[model samples]
Target chain A: MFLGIRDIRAAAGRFALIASVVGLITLLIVMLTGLTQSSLLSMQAFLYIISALVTVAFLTVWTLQRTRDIAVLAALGASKRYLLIDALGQAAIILAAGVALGAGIGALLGWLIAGSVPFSLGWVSVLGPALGIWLLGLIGATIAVRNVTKVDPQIALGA
Target chain B: MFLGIRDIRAAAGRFALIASVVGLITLLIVMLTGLTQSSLLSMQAFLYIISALVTVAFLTVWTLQRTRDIAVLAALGASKRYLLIDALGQAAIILAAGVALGAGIGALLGWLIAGSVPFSLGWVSVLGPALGIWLLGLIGATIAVRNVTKVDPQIALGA
Candidate 1:
């Protein structure tokens, strides 16, 4: 909760831009993911490669943005390991609940937007997006932890 | 599509910034995916999650920064598919060349860094990033397409 206000105060525009972009990116990913999988079903597993590609690009973007923040947090005396653990810990619990709530809402929404999502998801389909979203949060946390491993520790007191 | 140059030019700073961010993003994916999945022993799936977040952040930046050009292109006169096909095609080719060159250097550096990399990747992992780079190119294509699809293409021959 505090993180929200400070984040908004410090980097509101950046965050807002990011928020807007993430929405579009999600839309794009959903649409593309749908298209590639649809085409793959009609053809062969042609989209497996494409789906993996999307995940990779998504992964790249995730890392670049937060490494600095994580680095700084560690430099400020936050244990890199703990910091990452805390971040992920909070995220997982929250996201788990969010997912539950989302499913509930989605169940409600299904009546209106019901037909949008394919009821049948293949192993690849479930695994791909699931893997994609999970990687989104965790990889950056670890990399951020890596920064802690590198913290000079001297910088903690000075700069 | 056509306005890509403008996108590149107008937001050169943002684009370059994201590119640099993405390059690091690119580097991380390259390193980890080429990695040995050591987390396998640790049973901590956090790294996978962190990686994906980092990728999405930078990608969100890249795509957002590029949106104006895409919007302009469509506002002018071009289909998203045409833009996607042409622009993403160029991006695909460019990335392919870059990846091959990077791989060549990677193999050499891998050998130089250690005694040897003995590095060989499976089909899915290798094709994953390649396809991703291309699809990112499509975000621009898709945005341009959306704008174009709504516009009047007959403007080109107009007075």
Candidate 2:
């Protein structure tokens, strides 16, 4: 409940580092979550293997850090469930915001480099990928939280 | 080290439940992982979102639970590093065992249904997905354990 954004701000470096790792993981997941059309465009089986490898690497890195952080929080003042929801919500908001910002940056970069490429901002096309990536991160984090609830809270709180 | 196989056996029902839950989640991930391939086969682009959602789910689950376990173990003379490695190792063994079993089951069912499909069992195809999945599971599990070593032993004793 009310995962303090201020806490993130106060520890911007740590959070930024964390978010960057998460974003990269998100990016990796998006890269793998292939579209039917584009997949046919590439070598089938090889692509799948590469995609799976990337997914594993990113998901591993992102999820591990996230769960550790949330457990610490839950042990502090929050419920593990609350930590779960809050971490997810935070990821959603942040990822969405990051996507928008990245899109903006891309547009800026595109304008300076390409000079006259008509901006193709198809919300429908991008929406699924964006949401998909965010959800991957969310689930990764949530699954980690489930463990918190199962364990002795005293162990978690480090009383 | 040995979380006492006896404990695991005595609480087999409960652990089995958790293991089953883990399997289901793994199944979900496999489905999501397959979505990219399936979608590409159909000229659709839905797997990205699905994979993303699943990644987050996986990351959250692995890190949160394993981190807690590592912390507790480390406080009680168990090495956090060893605990983390053990998780990764166990997860590796589990994935390999599960994939092999599933393939066997699929073969059995195919034989039952088709009565004569002439399926040739090959290690190449098997190793490909097996390695990929194992890596994914391991990475996610490892990332979750990064905090394991950092936790003060005092925090782990469940004081």
Candidate 3:
């Protein structure tokens, strides 16, 4: 847990970039959710899929870059389960922060534009999409982190 | 030019991930463009921004991961202009392939569903969003690749 936090802090720029992308996507999704029209609701599925793909791609790249670290840790006695938990924990933190930032901004915008737009600012509109994004993002992150279990300890020795 | 092509082939997985994201977003944009209503057209801008952000994020990560390679090329007497063009050319190819795939799928889908849906398949509906995505993606890629010029040759020696 501590190691994951420290690792995120160490690569703050990369993490920030990923978080920003997640946040931006969340913002758009939340905004879309606010629309009361049934026709517009169909787009939500597409947005959800895009967000999932983005999460998977970003986390996959991140995990791939740390293959050596994972191998070294495994070589030193770190369990695959432990590494998986740590990676998922890091993903959870990123998703929570990004979702909150995005949902907050989206709700604020919906409120501001409610008079002119067909937007409804309710807890359902905000929290619903936020939960969806966080859940889908975690699933994608889990898929990405699964690769850690396959890292051969001998790889740490350049084998 | 050859180096860039070879490099992309070398990291096929990473490039494919980026291209897939770009393609999916393009598919969504093209579908939305098929809508004749003015209200839905507003969503077009949002999709464009998201695609641009996705392009920038993916390309930035891709470029950052190749920092060492860029340094080595610089140390080998590669000009900044050459590196920049190589990077952009790689981006162009990825964008072209993704946009084409997405546009083709989108057009086919629109044609299949046009009988029931409010979709209008036309050159403007398909090509307009395709061009927009490709152009914005190129611009975003350019921003990401600009960092290549700053790679110091000394870094190739681990200085």
Candidate 2 ranges with C-alpha deviation above 4 Å: A1-3, A18-89, A107-158, B4-76, B79-85, B106-121, B146-151, B156-158
- Residue B5 accuracy (lDDT) in model 1: 56
Decide which is better by DockQ, 1 or 2: 2
Q: Which candidate is the best by DockQ?
A: 2
Give the per-residue Cα lDDT of candidate 3 at B34. Answer: 81
DockQ of 3: 0.15
Q: lDDT for every model?
A: 0.43, 0.47, 0.85
Model 3 vs. true fold: TM? 0.74
Better of 1 and 2 by TM-score: 2
lDDT of 2: 0.47
Q: Per-residue lDDT tens digits of candidate 2, residues B11-91? A: 567445544544444343333333332544332223323233333344445445555555677677876567666655554
TM-score of chain A of each: 0.43, 0.53, 0.94
lDDT of 1 by residue, B117-145 (tens): 54445554445654554355445434433
Question: In model 1, how large is the Cα lDDT of residue B142?
Answer: 44
- iRMSD value for model 1: 17.5
Q: Model 1: C-alpha RMSD to truth? A: 15.4
Candidate 1 local lDDT, residue A141: 39
Better candidate number, 2 or 3, judged by DockQ: 2
